[PDB]
Design a protein around this nucleic acid. Structure first.
Ligand SMILES: [Mg+2]
Ligand SMILES: [Mg+2]
Ligand SMILES: [Mg+2]
Ligand SMILES: [Mg+2]
Ligand SMILES: [Mg+2]
Ligand SMILES: [Mg+2]
Ligand SMILES: [Mg+2]
Ligand SMILES: [Mg+2]
Ligand SMILES: [Mg+2]
Ligand SMILES: [Mg+2]
Ligand SMILES: [Mg+2]
Ligand SMILES: [Mg+2]
Lengths: 154, 396, 112
RNA sequence: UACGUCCCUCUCCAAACGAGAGAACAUGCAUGGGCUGGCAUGAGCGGCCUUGAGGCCUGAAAUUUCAUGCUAGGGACACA
RNA sequence: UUAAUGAGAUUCCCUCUGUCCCGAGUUACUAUCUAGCGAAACGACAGUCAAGGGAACGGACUUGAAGGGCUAAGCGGGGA
RNA sequence: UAGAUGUGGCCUGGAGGUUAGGACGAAGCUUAUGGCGUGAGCCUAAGAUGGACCGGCCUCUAGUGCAGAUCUUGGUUGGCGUAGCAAAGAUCUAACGGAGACGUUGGAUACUGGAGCGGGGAAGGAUUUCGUGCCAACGGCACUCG
RNA sequence: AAGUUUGAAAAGCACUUUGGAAAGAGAGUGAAAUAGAACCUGAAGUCGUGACAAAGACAAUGGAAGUACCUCCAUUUCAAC
């Protein structure tokens, strides 16, 4: 089985995945959805400026008591962050799907990020230690990231 | 049973950040049509404070006797450039503007106020109003509303802004123009536009608005302190040293009923940076500029030559270069925050508020120190050609 | 790159008044944050953020201990390169070093 | 492709973070000089006091005027 | 009844002080913001008020009065 | 309501009979798949589901129906990217390595301060030693290191 | 605790290339990879994005009764009752 949505044209499209993306589902969620209609070059340009901390990732749906910032007004909000590990982990998943656009013969300067999809993986376990001898969980919560691309005819 | 008088004043709630730093008169004085058309407000910039010595009057015990040291405030007041005229209908839902004539020219600092960048912009503000003013329909559509400001209008308010390129202060980092509507409180509104229409696009200097020995009210915005706690914001009390979870709190902020916290109990939040008014602040001197009279602070009994600017400027402000106004006492600003003067509401008929004043002494001793010297040409007299100038005034 | 590539391998010998940049800062962090606010000083001085320290500037800032820091430091800024071009490049770093001067009253910003 | 706003940088009358007040070749920033003000006579030297109210510090969470030095213009919506 | 001894109980006096009148400023460390990491207790549903009645001190009923939404920091009134 | 009773009445597992399906797709599973029974429930369709068993009826049989037991077990979830990761030593730099905050070396400033973050042992542990790799998860941050 | 019960057969993904290698995209195996070893089926719960009435919050839910629009769901007529 694959891939919640089909690109509606398979040769004019690239595809890329990760499965155990090693960091928080919740930071990776909005890191991903923030680029979900953007061109591929405008999406790396976003992430590479999130890392210089000049644009932020607008946390929707997992904002939940994160601090307010000025850099999130463009996104129509007050909240937003600069998750380094989840952004550098999709710099890589995008440059993969670049390599899938050259492999088919598609200018990546024409690729649009259609349908990113982040979800939850098997949620690794490593106990921690509470007061009074209570052994509580310390789940890691990895994530799967899907996305495919397409072109836009002139 | 036992109790105490309540902490803080409920008539300054909410303790909220003022909506702008610009001090803005909420109400202008009652329109006495028995007076002459004039301007009842003016925007100054808080330079700082100092103190003065006064020949006292008003026979009492501490008065009708030797002098007194009273702290004052120096407010630099450059002349204001009137740009518009604004009239209001007296409609049953409260005043409403019935148009606004502008001047033909509109200073480049005024037009910055309609921007927030102004240097990447194309500066189109008031472009089709300079153009359309030179037209004939412009003159029509301008006298069509001046002939309205007499039919429908009751309140007439010129729009004045500050001259800041005429305020060579740099520590006032802003180059926009502070824009303030100013009531005219003459009579016979027909003759009220006549003033407005006249002094439009002309500078209004502060002594034209105010006189020397009379008092104003100072609409201003308090010095901000951010989030201050309960003991500082309301001044309630400190709990005993023995308290757990610390002691700078209000212990009981609610009975069981009502089961909601009241708006009256003290809580922590914005303290300072509120809009206050300071009724009845009395002007002691409204002296002119050093460019025109470089003997500001030498009245009659300090026959030496000096200026208001202390030794080493006012701390954190600079030199006063413009038509300063000297009030008496406190003003709810930090340095270089715009204050708005206003002619007062109170009846003001009193032997403690209508009495005239002569200032026998003013202090220019430096704010930055303790200062023991007035008029730095006194410091040179105390010392000698010490090694700083000796290495320059003897090395030639 | 108007005033950036117009010179090649600049050298300006400029004073960095540090008591102004480290005031009431925690003493334990004062000698590290001295280094760090010379980076973002000489960065703003030459529009680049890749600033090395030539181990005599570093030895100087630390010579009075982590808490004691000199009030001023006179610095020789070398901006050598690996000669990139275009945009978003790396080949403009800085070889910030110290200058023994024994006095700071009279000396302005110099060059070469 | 418009007028514009916003981010990034800087400033600080503002500030927990937002927001605010600003500037965006400007006295802007950085040094220095001068003022103002702290301290209380500097390393060294002459004959211990003398040089000498000296030296040092002085805007920096952010005193004040003068000389010289460098001095992003890029992004994001607006925008369809 | 008692000298000595007392982290014993008690009262006064002296000294001394922020215990206080009456608080204020400073400092680390935190809280705050960020990168990384990440729990739990608890969890019917929830969740603006006043009055009424009621297992007699309601979040839901009755009748009124407010209430656009989503929010960050607090606090400790209530959620018997 | 407690209770009693009836039902040619409903349903699950299995038996004895009968009738019958199934690789031209059985059980199962999904549901804006309708219909039809007052209901329990049944039947259908359509699955870009499933792959090999099983339905109806008459009797028999029982480990036969679950929302609620501070139920039991498994799993998930909210709070929530939140509380926090705040006692105990402050890392700073070069150039070097490396896929890359990391390590190594040099220099620098430190901390332990000889009742030690020292060197040796007993008790206890038993490969934790060492080297060379390695870096998935473990070292509550990270790691090229352990 | 734990049936790895993948498939009939390991035929267990050669090889190309993006990645430092993993993993990904392709191919290829086979009846199925939507059977890829944490593998028969794959449910509930919760989540994700795509769509929508794109509705519209001023507890949720629910009752009755309509209406709006949309539904390869049933039925009926589709030269007629
Ligand atoms: Mg206690
Ligand atoms: Mg600041
Ligand atoms: Mg602003
Ligand atoms: Mg200076
Ligand atoms: Mg400055
Ligand atoms: Mg519970
Ligand atoms: Mg709130
Ligand atoms: Mg809250
Ligand atoms: Mg059985
Ligand atoms: Mg049973
Ligand atoms: Mg159950
Ligand atoms: Mg339960």
């Amino acid at each position: 089985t694959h891939y919640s949505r089909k690109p509606q044209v398979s040769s004019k499209s690239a595809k890329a995945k990760v499965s155990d993306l090693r960091c928080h589902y919740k930071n990776t969620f909005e890191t991903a959805n923030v680029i979900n209609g953007m061109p591929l070059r405008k999406a790396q340009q976003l992430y590479r400026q999130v890392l210089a901390k000049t644009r932020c990732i607008p946390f929707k749906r997992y904002n939940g008591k994160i601090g307010r910032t000025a850099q999130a007004k463009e996104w129509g909000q007050t909240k937003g962050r600069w998750p380094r590990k989840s952004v550098v982990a999709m710099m890589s998943l995008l440059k993969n799907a670049e390599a899938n656009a050259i492999e088919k013969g598609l200018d990546p300067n024409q690729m649009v990020i259609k349908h990113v999809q982040v979800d939850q993986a098997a949620r690794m376990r490593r106990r921690t230690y509470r007061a009074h001898g209570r052994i509580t969980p310390y789940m890691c919560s990895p994530c799967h990231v899907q996305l495919f691309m397409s072109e836009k005819k002139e | 049973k036992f109790e105490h008088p309540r902490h803080g004043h409920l008539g300054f709630l909410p303790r909220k950040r003022s909506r702008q730093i610009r001090g803005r008169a909420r109400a202008f004085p009652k329109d006495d049509a028995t007076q002459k058309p004039h301007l009842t407000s003016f925007m100054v910039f808080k330079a700082g404070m100092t103190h003065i010595v006064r020949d006292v009057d008003r026979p009492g015990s501490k008065v009708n006797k030797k002098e007194v040291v009273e702290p004052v405030t120096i407010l630099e007041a450059p002349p204001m450039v009137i740009v518009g005229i604004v009239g209001y209908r007296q409609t049953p839902v409260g005043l409403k503007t019935i148009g606004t004539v502008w001047a033909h020219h509109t200073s480049v600092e005024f037009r910055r106020r309609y921007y927030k960048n102004w240097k990447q912009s194309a500066q189109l503000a008031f472009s089709r109003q300079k153009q359309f003013a030179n037209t004939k329909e412009g003159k029509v559509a301008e006298a069509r509303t001046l002939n309205a400001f007499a039919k429908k209008a009751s309140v007439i308010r010129v729009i004045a802004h500050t001259q800041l390129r005429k305020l060579r202060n740099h520590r006032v980092g802003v180059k926009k123009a502070h824009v303030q509507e100013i009531q005219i409180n003459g009579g016979n509104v027909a003759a009220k536009i006549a003033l407005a229409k006249s002094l439009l696009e002309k500078e209004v200097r502060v002594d034209s608005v105010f006189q020397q020995s009379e008092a104003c009210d100072v609409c201003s915005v308090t010095k901000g302190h951010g989030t201050e706690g309960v003991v500082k914001r309301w001044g309630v009390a400190c709990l005993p040293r023995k308290t757990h979870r610390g002691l700078r709190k209000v212990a009981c902020i609610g009975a069981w009923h009502p089961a909601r916290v009241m708006y009256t109990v003290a809580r922590a939040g914005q303290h300072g940076y509120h809009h206050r008014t300071q009724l009845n602040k009395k002007i002691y001197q409204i002296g002119r500029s050093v460019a025109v009279e470089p003997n500001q602070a030498t009245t009659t009994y300090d026959l030496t030559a000096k200026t208001i600017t202390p030794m080493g400027g006012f701390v954190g402000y600079g030199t006063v270069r413009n038509d300063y106004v000297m009030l008496k006492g406190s003003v709810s600003g930090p340095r270089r925050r715009v204050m708005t003067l206003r002619r007062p509401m109170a009846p003001q008929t009193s032997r403690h508020l209508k009495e005239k004043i002569v200032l026998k002494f003013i202090d220019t001793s430096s704010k930055i120190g303790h200062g023991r010297f007035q008029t730095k040409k006194e410091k040179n007299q105390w010392f000698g050609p010490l090694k700083k100038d000796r290495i320059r005034r003897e090395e030639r | 790159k108007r005033t950036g590539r117009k010179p090649d391998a600049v050298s300006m010998e400029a004073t960095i008044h540090l008591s102004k940049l480290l005031k009431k800062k925690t003493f334990s962090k004062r000698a590290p944050l001295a280094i760090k606010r010379i980076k973002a000083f000489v960065g703003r001085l030459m529009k680049t953020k890749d600033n090395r320290i030539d181990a005599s500037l570093n030895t100087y800032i630390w010579h009075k201990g982590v808490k004691g820091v000199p009030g001023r430091v006179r610095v020789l800024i070398q901006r050598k390169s690996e000669t990139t071009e275009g945009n978003k490049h790396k080949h403009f770093y800085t070889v910030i070093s110290n200058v023994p001067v024994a006095s700071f009253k009279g000396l302005t910003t110099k060059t070469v």
